[PDB]
Design an enzyme around this catalytic site. Structure first.
Site, PDB file in Angstrom:
ATOM      1  N   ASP A 161     -34.133  70.482  14.305  1.00  0.00           N
ATOM      2  CA  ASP A 161     -32.721  70.801  14.479  1.00  0.00           C
ATOM      3  C   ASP A 161     -32.497  72.280  14.096  1.00  0.00           C
ATOM      4  OD1 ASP A 161     -29.979  70.319  14.989  1.00  0.00           O
ATOM      5  OD2 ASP A 161     -29.594  69.591  12.989  1.00  0.00           O
TER       6      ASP A 161
ATOM      7  N   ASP B 162     -35.137  68.823   9.461  1.00  0.00           N
ATOM      8  CA  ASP B 162     -33.745  69.239   9.301  1.00  0.00           C
ATOM      9  C   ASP B 162     -33.431  69.607   7.850  1.00  0.00           C
ATOM     10  OD1 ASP B 162     -31.138  69.806  10.129  1.00  0.00           O
ATOM     11  OD2 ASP B 162     -30.469  67.730   9.947  1.00  0.00           O
TER      12      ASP B 162
END
Ligand SMILES: C[S@@+](CC[C@H](N)C(=O)[O-])C[C@H]1O[C@@H](n2cnc3c(N)ncnc32)[C@H](O)[C@@H]1O
Ligand SMILES: O=[N+]([O-])c1cc(O)c(O)c([N+](=O)[O-])c1
Ligand SMILES: [Mg+2]
Length: 213
Positions: A166, A138
């Protein structure tokens, strides 16, 4: 700074030693006052389910920011499990440490201050890491693929290691997504959700390392 405000909001509104209240405080602040790049509760809920299924002993996070996901993951970790999170911005890293301290999870999480590319090769030596059970990606989107390749080169991935990424939709990670889905070395599953603090559709991608060909 915004990060300072989120922290102050947590300190003045959350229950110390209670990870849940800490999460709820951050979510409320960001939903109502200022948007922040935390994974959020919608996607966070998917993260929880994945963590519970695999019960990883050693987890590596790339991109801590203010500690939202670190708190989210660590609160579900079993006794003895460690979470190592990397953050290149020293200011964000400081906030994260304080966030972890307030939540009472500081003994489970180790913050690595530095760029992932520089730190990954030192993981085995300085932190006694053999292989990773799970990796949460992320950080800057252009780093997903090079770091995944770097992780493999350093021998940090075992058959069964779960990579969870993500923003595979928004902002997007084109090269990484194409690579994992097209490789025989990964078994991928996509979880549709929504971008944090809004109706933009986003999703997480679970890619399980099968080992080389
Ligand atoms: C999307 S924000 C982090 C999100 C966090 N996972 C959460 O949900 O709370 C990610 C961050 O990674 C950083 N990041 C970017 N590139 C990095 C790198 N190469 N290595 C480590 N940290 C990095 C930024 O400074 C920022 O705090
Ligand atoms: O711009 N955004 O909406 C995002 C969202 C995110 O969830 C991010 O992780 C991000 N980033 O690392 O730059 C950016
Ligand atoms: Mg994100």
């Amino acid at each position: 700074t915004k990060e300072q405000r989120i922290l102050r909001y947590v300190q003045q509104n959350a229950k110390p030693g209670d990870p849940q209240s800490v999460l709820e405080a951050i979510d409320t602040y960001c939903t109502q006052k200022e948007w922040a790049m935390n994974v959020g509760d919608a996607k966070g809920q998917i993260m929880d389910a994945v963590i519970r299924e695999y019960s990883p002993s050693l987890v590596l996070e790339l991109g801590a920011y203010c500690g939202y996901s670190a708190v989210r993951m660590a609160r579900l970790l079993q006794p003895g499990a460690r979470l190592l999170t990397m953050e290149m911005n020293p200011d964000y890293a400081a906030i994260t440490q304080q966030m972890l301290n307030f939540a009472g999870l500081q003994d489970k999480v180790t913050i690595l201050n530095g760029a992932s590319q520089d730190l990954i090769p030192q993981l085995k030596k300085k932190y006694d890491v053999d292989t990773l059970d799970m990796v949460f990606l992320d950080h800057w989107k252009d780093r997903y693929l090079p770091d995944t390749l770097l992780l493999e080169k350093c021998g940090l991935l075992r058959k069964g290691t779960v990579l969870l990424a993500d923003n595979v939709i928004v902002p997007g990670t084109p090269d990484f997504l194409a690579y994992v889905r097209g490789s025989s070395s990964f078994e991928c599953t996509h979880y549709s959700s929504y971008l944090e603090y809004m109706k933009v559709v986003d999703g997480l991608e679970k890619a399980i390392y099968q080992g080389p060909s």
